[PDB]
Amino acid sequence: KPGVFSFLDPLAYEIWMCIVFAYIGVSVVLFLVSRFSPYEWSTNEFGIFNSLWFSLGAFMQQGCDISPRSLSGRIVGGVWWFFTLIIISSYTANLAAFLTVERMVSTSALSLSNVAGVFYILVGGLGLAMLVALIEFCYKSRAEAKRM
Template sequence: MVAENILGQPKRYKGFSIDVLDALAKILGFKYEIYQVADSKYGSQLPNGSWNGMIGDLINKRADLAVSAITITPERENVVDFSKRYLDYSVGILLRKPEEKINIFSLFAPFDLAVWACIAAAIPVVGVLIFLLNRLQALRSSSSQNGPPGHLSNGVGSGTLHSAIWIVYGAFVQQGGDGVVGSVALRIVMGSWWLFTLIVCSSYTANLAAYLTVSRMDHAIR
């Protein structure tokens, strides 16, 4: 609400609050005269219980209504009636928009370094376990069939260690394998590994999508 004084004429007020007051006067059919309170205050309660400012003028019936961007507080609501608020003021802080930095290693961001290390260690460990179970199955099969030792008739891969690790890695990246799992122990190990890779891959996909779509706020204020 701004007051103007042009060529000695009385002050003329303008602004959003005055527009609201003019609309109310036109709809309800009343005339008004604006004046500023003597102490130029909104209104606060004094130690003796009285009020100053616009609230005090309303309580003492020196004014019929007050128009201003005044804050609605419980103390003020106990002594005067407020209309529904039509303006909301908020305080904000402006910061310079940070420069977007492209990180080529953002694909590793969904998991911590410890998680990647555990995954990298789990692949050869499971590969060695599958290799040992495959060899054990081969020995049992050769002893029962009197065949040459190490001959695999129904196992995973070709029976070598690097083939077993490759099969485990292929299952982790969801590319499948090239062998048939025969023994119950191999089925349990491979089934557990497939379930583990399903959970890890699903978690990685969800975290990567959230990481790439949700903008993370960088606290520029230190």
């Protein structure tokens, strides 16, 4: 009877917590080095919101709308890329080890019970996104109606 969030088993909980903290630190440092200098004012679209988006896309190994162009920003991006590559490969390798070792214990295909948790997370995120969009629409409409 696999747990709902059993897809997180291959890495320990301390690794996940430190992944969150490292993500926050990398995003903050990328925003700091990209935007603090008045002499670079800007030529780059790396605010704190865009920095967090860049870091999240980098960890998920998905497409980037922007990439750092300065030396310090590229240093931050490169070390974050290395961290992401190592961590994702470790997750895949330990999951393969878990499944292989469970297979050689004295059905075969992965069941929906093994990934029901990521499904629940996805649907909850879709709901939260819809709530955010409708709240923004309502606030803007109230602002516009009161404006005129």
